[PDB]
Write a protein that binds this ligand. Sequence first.
Ligand code: ML1
Ligand code: ML1
Ligand code: NAG
Length: 345
Amino acid sequence: DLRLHLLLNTSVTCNDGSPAGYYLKESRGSRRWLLFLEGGWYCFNRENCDSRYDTMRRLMSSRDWPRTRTGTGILSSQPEENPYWWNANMVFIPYCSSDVWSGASSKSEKNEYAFMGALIIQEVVRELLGRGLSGAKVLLLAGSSAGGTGVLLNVDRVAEQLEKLGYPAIQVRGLADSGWFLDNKQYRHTAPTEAIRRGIRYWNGVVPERCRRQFQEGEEWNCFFGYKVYPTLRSPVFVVQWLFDEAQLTVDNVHLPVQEGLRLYIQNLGRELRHTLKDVPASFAPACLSHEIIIRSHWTDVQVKGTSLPRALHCWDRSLHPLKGCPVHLVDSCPWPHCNPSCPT
Ligand SMILES: COc1ccc2[nH]cc(CCNC(C)=O)c2c1
Ligand SMILES: COc1ccc2[nH]cc(CCNC(C)=O)c2c1
Ligand SMILES: *[C@@H]1O[C@H](CO)[C@@H](O)[C@H](O)[C@H]1NC(C)=O
């Protein structure tokens, strides 16, 4: 169980103005710190945020959060469940800003909602430095789905914050799970790129500086797509992505007797995802239809080329000190979902 702490700076808020916060379980024998960003889609205008407030209020407000949370998967403290980092200090940061962790906007007379995801991360990091983070050797910023994209948008900002605060010994790294999407041609029409474009204006969203300077004013939506923002990052980042991600297929208007047109569409999607990962040295991408993995209790079960994800992350740790029998780049080459026998059922 991790215990809830509301932010002492109560001007850093969830969408409705309630204070944001974090759940913490300390491990006093450890110099490793894991900060996990929750996911949960987003909203991008008044009407669609109003509907989210009716039926997804815990993703917009802290008024109804519980005092504790159980750590699962990579957040578990049991070695049987978490072979990688069971002895680490564990932090779960709830997602209550609906902005893919990019916002820097307060509630005001002109703004019904606050969008402060980027500021929430920096305030958590600050307040944690007085609870033991000042002694850390490694800070791993991790996250799933919207939180995985949040890692890509924020890991370099955390690194810069700690250097300017006077903590150059802390090594900042990122782990992005299920947040690596393609701005591809859809199977049918009914678009995420335009929703993100409008969202950035609504949230006053911020993106990493080198990416912003490449794409320039008006085109910051490009930095929400992993294969475009990743080459601009300086911190080491490990990318986890199912080749046939369910959220990707949903926005592509695919719902699973598959005939030739859809077969070719699905096979081309896996090929394109594989291609975007060829220059990503630390990555784990199985040929499965699924979504998210790192906080699932059975995350230890899936393997690529005989190597589990906990093992791949351990090999990554060793590489940041070409290891024999300890690989870090693991991408499936077979072309259809569940061609890998370790895929979840
Ligand atoms: C799950 O919601 C998210 C989270 C992070 C994201 N980054 C970029 C996009 C838009 C394209 N992908 C989808 C699923 O629409 C996005 C959506
Ligand atoms: C590749 O062909 C095209 C052509 C025109 C387009 N407009 C917008 C998109 C991106 C659509 N994908 C998602 C997931 O948002 C697009 C793609
Ligand atoms: C609280 O957070 C806000 C938003 O980042 C910041 O402007 C302010 O300086 C913070 N308060 C203190 C006392 O540092």
